[PDB]
Amino acid sequence: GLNLVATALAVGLGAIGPGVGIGIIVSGAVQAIGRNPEIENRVVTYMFIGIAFTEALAIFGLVIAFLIG
Amino acid sequence: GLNLVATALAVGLGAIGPGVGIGIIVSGAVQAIGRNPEIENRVVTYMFIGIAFTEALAIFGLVIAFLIG
Amino acid sequence: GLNLVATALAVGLGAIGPGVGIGIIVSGAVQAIGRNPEIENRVVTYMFIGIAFTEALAIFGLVIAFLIG
Amino acid sequence: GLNLVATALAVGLGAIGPGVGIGIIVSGAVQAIGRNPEIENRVVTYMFIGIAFTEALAIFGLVIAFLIG
Amino acid sequence: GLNLVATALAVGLGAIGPGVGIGIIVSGAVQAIGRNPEIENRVVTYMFIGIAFTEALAIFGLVIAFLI
Amino acid sequence: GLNLVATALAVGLGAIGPGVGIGIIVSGAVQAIGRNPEIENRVVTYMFIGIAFTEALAIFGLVIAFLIG
Amino acid sequence: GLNLVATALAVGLGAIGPGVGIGIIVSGAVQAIGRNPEIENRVVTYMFIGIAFTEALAIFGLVIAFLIG
Amino acid sequence: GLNLVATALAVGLGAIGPGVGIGIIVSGAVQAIGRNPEIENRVVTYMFIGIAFTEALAIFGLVIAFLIG
Amino acid sequence: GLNLVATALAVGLGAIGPGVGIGIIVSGAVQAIGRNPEIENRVVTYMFIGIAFTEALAIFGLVIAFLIG
Amino acid sequence: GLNLVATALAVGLGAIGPGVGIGIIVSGAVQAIGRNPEIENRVVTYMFIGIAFTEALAIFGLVIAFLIG
Amino acid sequence: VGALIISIASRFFLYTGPPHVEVAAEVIFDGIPGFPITNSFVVAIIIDIFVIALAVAATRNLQMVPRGLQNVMEFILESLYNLFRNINAKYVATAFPLVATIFLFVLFGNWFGLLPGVGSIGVCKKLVPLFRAPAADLNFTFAIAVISFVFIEYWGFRALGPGYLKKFFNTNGIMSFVGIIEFISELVKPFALAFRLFGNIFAGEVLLVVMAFLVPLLLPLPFYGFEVFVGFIQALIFALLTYAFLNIAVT
Amino acid sequence: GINPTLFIAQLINFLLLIFILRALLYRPVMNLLNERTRRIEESVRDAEKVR
Amino acid sequence: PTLFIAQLINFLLLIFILRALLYRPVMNLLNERTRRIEESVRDAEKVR
Amino acid sequence: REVMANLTARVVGAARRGTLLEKRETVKSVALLVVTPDRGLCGSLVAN
């Protein structure tokens, strides 16, 4: 049953990084909005593309684990 | 019992990043509202969005661990 | 006896994250409160929400560990 | 022997988060104290709340190790 | 099944650090925009050249994962 | 030789968290003292309290390592 | 498959430190640009120097992995 | 050879924490010095106390590794 | 093939730390330069020596990795 | 061949922390010098000893790796 | 109150009574030829008719003066409308029906998944459980995800032209490298949302069941309330992320 | 096992759901939100008109 | 089985603790809301 | 005076030269402050 450990390691190690990344993203976004309330329309765009790339990074490992499953 | 270690790692690993991300988001949002009280009603939404992204990564780890178990 | 190390790994790797998460939550909350103690309840509410979410992830790790235990 | 390794991991791992969260809590609390001395009782109470929350996970890991022992 | 755990470790450890890199990049970009929206045209380009380099290592990890 | 590896894991893993916690504590306390020297007594007392907490959490692993060894 | 897991471990671990380093480099350079557009090329040169150092470390990891595989 | 792996793990894991702790201590102390140099004689003492604590943890790990060796 | 995974682990772990260190160094240096372009050469000298010291550990790890490989 | 992986692990885990610590030291020192140019004389004299303390852990790791080898 | 925390009731049949786990990823109820209707499908149907009845009661004799059910329904709808206007104000009404129905149905399904009887009531022979949360079925979460993906793709083709050069292909610069990653992330988005909702409800069901296995009494009181919060937050964020993806695709 | 026919059946269920709930509630409730907004707007215009 | 009564009384106590924490707060989000609503409607009652 | 000179030396970008420091274009309204004696007998000063 080594494939079970393989999937476990894939999913576990493909999320510890992206979670901190998303946290840093939206924390910086919230701080910037609080400092500069006027500029919100376009900064959220960069926040969300960063979120999308980080989520894609995590889902790469998730999909690899599902393939192994 | 390799399946036991597999499901232990799938949940253990993959939840480290979500916790730190939740903490970073909470700290950033709290600081932002402390500096900018009136935008709290608008920025708590993005705070919860980031928190739920992190919890979503954690939940991916959890469900994969349950499937392995 | 691999169940023992599986449980230990689950507990450890599910607890290291939430500790840092709650630590950042409390640090941000106390910093913001010190910056302006005028607004207190509308900050402590989100502080406790973050603490509850992080402790919920910790208890997820705890219960999945106890399943093997 | 696994039992001993599991005890070491349960004591060892699961205390890193409750080794850094407490430190971040205390650093934030002393920073707020230096920034605001007259709010000492409130910030110390919330610091103790955070310390108790972190020590909860620490004691959970320790008692799990004792059970593994 | 050492190939399976190999691919797993490759993808996971290639997602560990580059994810944090993406996050720090975007946080810095948002901070700069909040402090100075008028430098957007150049700062977003700097962010993009940075984010491509940061994602390059993740792309390498995925390539090695697919090769295995 | 597995119990020796268990002792190594207990000692090494039991200091990762407390070391960083003590470091963050001392950094925050010293930065606050530089910001405000007159709050040095209270900052040093809370610094000692936090360092004692982290040291006790390190001793939790140290005693287990001694028992195994 | 120990060669395969060795190659994978080399690539995966070698991508962590350089990735976080590039991220911190770009964040610091971007924040400096936001605070000072007039030193743009001068700080961009150092940003590229740091990125080149991190990329050189990553290339060392990748080429070691290629040699192993 | 498990003794060799035990020494390696002990020396490694008992240095990663104290190293970051010492780094944080020195960064905070230097920042406080930059804020105020005249508080050097007072902040350097606690800086050395923190450095001594972290180095004591590291030396404990190294000595246990030497005993295993 | 234990030598292969040993080499891989050595290179990866020797790249993990120095990358982050170099990144923090360059971020701080560029931040200072943006704050104070007038002492650019003075701070950049310290930046280069710090980068060399950080790269020293990467070189050590890569050297041991080559020796094993 | 477990000695090979043992020494590789020792040299690897002896670097991930001290590199980050030295990087934090240099970043803080450069920032402090940017804030205060003329106090570089007393900033650098502490920065070097801090770097030496942080690198002592890495040197312990390397000498132990040599002994294992 | 004082110090009456005794927890005497908690120490009642810690693990002797209830079954160990008794959980499943997907179950089938069937009952008719052709389509094997599932119990999750049954909960979808009952929540559908329940929200229909609640709606008709809300729309029963609409008055200029809100009161009771009408007042709270208007509260939820107008709060959601303002929240979506806070992100984008040009494509609110277009996506408002889909967004609102997704949010409300997901919320009510998550809340019904926590009612007693969900894991207890089951037809026989093995005991296949009845009353399964609709989000616990991948067939439903993937359906919502693909519906949202079709909606966002159609509206992003309708507005801003069918170009998509930012994500399809670029001539020079790093935008060529950026465009492919944007396409990959866009493809990832529906699967990510589906797995998010499905897991965040199914894991909650598993946790409440297995906590009902061990010390069944008085311990899961906060976790049930937390699970209510988890379901509500999931229902809200699904809609919010759908609208945010729509807006960024418009941009 | 996920069945594409059952997947499409979930799509038909959600189609019934969205269409019937929308027609029976949301257009009445869009009339309600328009009622409050349009009525406040009537109040405002009549306010400056009466002064 | 025990799960039936366990879920029954745990959910009834969930509703009861929800009542304890949010009876006057459910009133805060319903009764005070309709007070806000009638405050809003009185203005254009007067304006006619 | 020299504090303001030092501060505006650093704040040189137009984006951050906002609020009171902004050099507005297309001037439309201008306010003038006049300080005068409260009492007469000042000679031509008030008239000037």
From Swiss-Prot, chains A, B, C, D, F, G, H, I, J:
One cellular component term (GO) for this entry is:
proton-transporting two-sector ATPase complex, proton-transporting domain
Give disulfide pairs as residue numbers: none
UniProt cross-references to CDD domains, sorted A to Z? ATP-synt_Fo_c
User: What broad class describes the main subcellular location of this protein?
Assistant: membrane
Instruction: List the GO biological process terms.
Output: proton motive force-driven ATP synthesis
Any one GO molecular function term: lipid binding
Q: What is this protein called?
A: ATP synthase subunit c
PROSITE patterns linked: ATPASE_C
According to its UniProt record, where is this protein located? Cell membrane
Return the HAMAP family for the record: ATP_synth_c_bact
In the bilayer, the protein is annotated as: Multi-pass membrane protein
Alphabetical UniProt keywords = ATP synthesis, Cell membrane, CF(0), Hydrogen ion transport, Ion transport, Lipid-binding, Membrane, Transmembrane, Transmembrane helix, Transport
Question: Could you tell me what this protein does?
Answer: F(1)F(0) ATP synthase produces ATP from ADP in the presence of a proton or sodium gradient. F-type ATPases consist of two structural domains, F(1) containing the extramembraneous catalytic core and F(0) containing the membrane proton channel, linked together by a central stalk and a peripheral stalk. During catalysis, ATP synthesis in the catalytic domain of F(1) is coupled via a rotary mechanism of the central stalk subunits to proton translocation. Key component of the F(0) channel; it plays a direct role in translocation across the membrane. A homomeric c-ring of between 10-14 subunits forms the central stalk rotor element with the F(1) delta and epsilon subunits.
Q: How does it assemble?
A: F-type ATPases have 2 components, F(1) - the catalytic core - and F(0) - the membrane proton channel. F(1) has five subunits: alpha(3), beta(3), gamma(1), delta(1), epsilon(1). F(0) has four main subunits: a(1), b(1), b'(1) and c(10-14). The alpha and beta chains form an alternating ring which encloses part of the gamma chain. F(1) is attached to F(0) by a central stalk formed by the gamma and epsilon chains, while a peripheral stalk is formed by the delta, b and b' chains.
Pfam families linked: ATP-synt_C (PF00137)
Site features described as Reversibly protonated during proton transport, chain residue numbers? 55
Alphabetical list of NCBIfam families matching this protein: ATP_synt_c
Q: Transmembrane ranges?
A: 5-25, 48-68
Highest taxon above the source species = Bacteria
Q: What Gene3D superfamilies does the annotation carry?
A: F1F0 ATP synthase subunit C
Point out the gene that encodes the protein: atpE
Swiss-Prot record, chain L:
Superkingdom, taxonomy of origin: Bacteria
Q: Where in the cell is it found?
A: Cell membrane
Q: Where are the transmembrane segments?
A: 1-20
Subunit-structure text: F-type ATPases have 2 components, F(1) - the catalytic core - and F(0) - the membrane proton channel. F(1) has five subunits: alpha(3), beta(3), gamma(1), delta(1), epsilon(1). F(0) has four main subunits: a(1), b(2) and c(10-14). The alpha and beta chains form an alternating ring which encloses part of the gamma chain. F(1) is attached to F(0) by a central stalk formed by the gamma and epsilon chains, while a peripheral stalk is formed by the delta and b chains.
UniProt family annotation:
Belongs to the ATPase B chain family.
Give the protein's biological function.
F(1)F(0) ATP synthase produces ATP from ADP in the presence of a proton or sodium gradient. F-type ATPases consist of two structural domains, F(1) containing the extramembraneous catalytic core and F(0) containing the membrane proton channel, linked together by a central stalk and a peripheral stalk. During catalysis, ATP synthesis in the catalytic domain of F(1) is coupled via a rotary mechanism of the central stalk subunits to proton translocation.
* Name assigned to this protein: ATP synthase subunit b
Q: Source species, please?
A: Chloroflexus aurantiacus (strain ATCC 29366 / DSM 635 / J-10-fl)
From Swiss-Prot, chain N:
- What domain of life is recorded for the organism? Bacteria
Positions of transmembrane segments: none
Compartments reported by the entry: Cell membrane
Q: Which family does it belong to?
A: Belongs to the ATPase gamma chain family.
- What does the UniProt function comment say about this protein? Produces ATP from ADP in the presence of a proton gradient across the membrane. The gamma chain is believed to be important in regulating ATPase activity and the flow of protons through the CF(0) complex.
Q: How does it assemble?
A: F-type ATPases have 2 components, CF(1) - the catalytic core - and CF(0) - the membrane proton channel. CF(1) has five subunits: alpha(3), beta(3), gamma(1), delta(1), epsilon(1). CF(0) has three main subunits: a, b and c.
The entry's protein name is ATP synthase gamma chain
Q: Organism source for this protein? A: Chloroflexus aurantiacus (strain ATCC 29366 / DSM 635 / J-10-fl)
Gene label: atpG
